[PDB]
Amino acid sequence: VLQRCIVSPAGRHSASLIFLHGSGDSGQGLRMWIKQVLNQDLTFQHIKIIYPTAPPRSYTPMKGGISNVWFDRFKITNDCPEHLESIDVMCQVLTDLIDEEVKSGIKKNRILIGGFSMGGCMAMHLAYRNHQDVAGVFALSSFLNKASAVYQALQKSNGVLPELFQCHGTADELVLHSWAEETNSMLKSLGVTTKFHSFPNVYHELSKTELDILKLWILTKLPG
Numbered sequence: 001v002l003q004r005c006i007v008s009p010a011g012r013h014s015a016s017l018i019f020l021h022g023s024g025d026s027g028q029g030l031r032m033w034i035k036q037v038l039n040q041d042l043t044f045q046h047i048k049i050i051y052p053t054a055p056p057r058s059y060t061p062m063k064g065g066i067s068n069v070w071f072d073r074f075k076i077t078n079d080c081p082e083h084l085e086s087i088d089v090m091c092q093v094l095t096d097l098i099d100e101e102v103k104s105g106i107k108k109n110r111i112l113i114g115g116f117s118m119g120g121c122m123a124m125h126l127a128y129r130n131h132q133d134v135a136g137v138f139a140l141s142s143f144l145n146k147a148s149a150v151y152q153a154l155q156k157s158n159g160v161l162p163e164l165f166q167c168h169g170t171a172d173e174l175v176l177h178s179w180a181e182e183t184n185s186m187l188k189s190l191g192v193t194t195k196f197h198s199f200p201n202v203y204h205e206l207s208k209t210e211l212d213i214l215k216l217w218i219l220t221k222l223p224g
């Protein structure tokens with residue numbers, strides 16, 4: 001079962017935020033990173049924050065070395081196929097996490113999924129392929145590979161889709177800004193309502209302005 005860090009709401013629990021860490025991190029590591037960036041913990045009045053940890057597994061860009069990665073990648077580029085087999089395994093594990101939140105009494109339309117780097121890619125696969133009834137999706141410094149299963153699923157979709165909140169730093173040398181912009185343009189052309197925030201002088205990192213406007217957007221999607 002997934003290990004996790006739970007940041008409670010201040011009052012009665014009525015919504016949930018599943019926040020997925022980037023490659024090589026952990027749920028507690030991301031929570032602590034956000035705490036450092038904001039100079040205090042990210043908390044809400046009625047939204048519970050769930051920071052699960054990717055189980056350690058082989059990671060091909062690390063030459064098969066073990067890392068806390070949600071899924072595998074052949075190479076760091078958007079120009080190669082995505083590794084669907086590892087993505088689908090993690091989609092099932094994270095569906096069990098969403099189902100335990102629903103079982104606890106939270107409607108799927110009161111759950112927001114998102115992440116940083118790999119976590120954002122994982123959140124997009126979850127929301128647009130299996131859980132189109134979530135309140136929304138957010139991706140921080142993330143991208144989808146060309147010919148993604150997300151695009152094929154959206155091509156075959158007809159309903160209302162979860163809104164995407166996407167942020168990227170223009171100077172990011174790990175996830176190129178062009179890969180994140182292409183992903184956002186692709187999703188928009190496929191019928192997804194999106195907000196794309198481009199941060200100049202921001203690299204592959206979390207910024208205080210980015211987290212402040214993300215918090216404001218989460219509150220519009222999960223009102224008290």
Ligand SMILES: *C(=O)N1CCCC[C@@H]1c1ccccc1
Binds near residue numbers: 117118
């Ligand atoms: C984020 O989690 N990342 C892992 C998948 C590829 C994009 C990004 C990354 C790129 C290069 C080096 C480390 C992380």
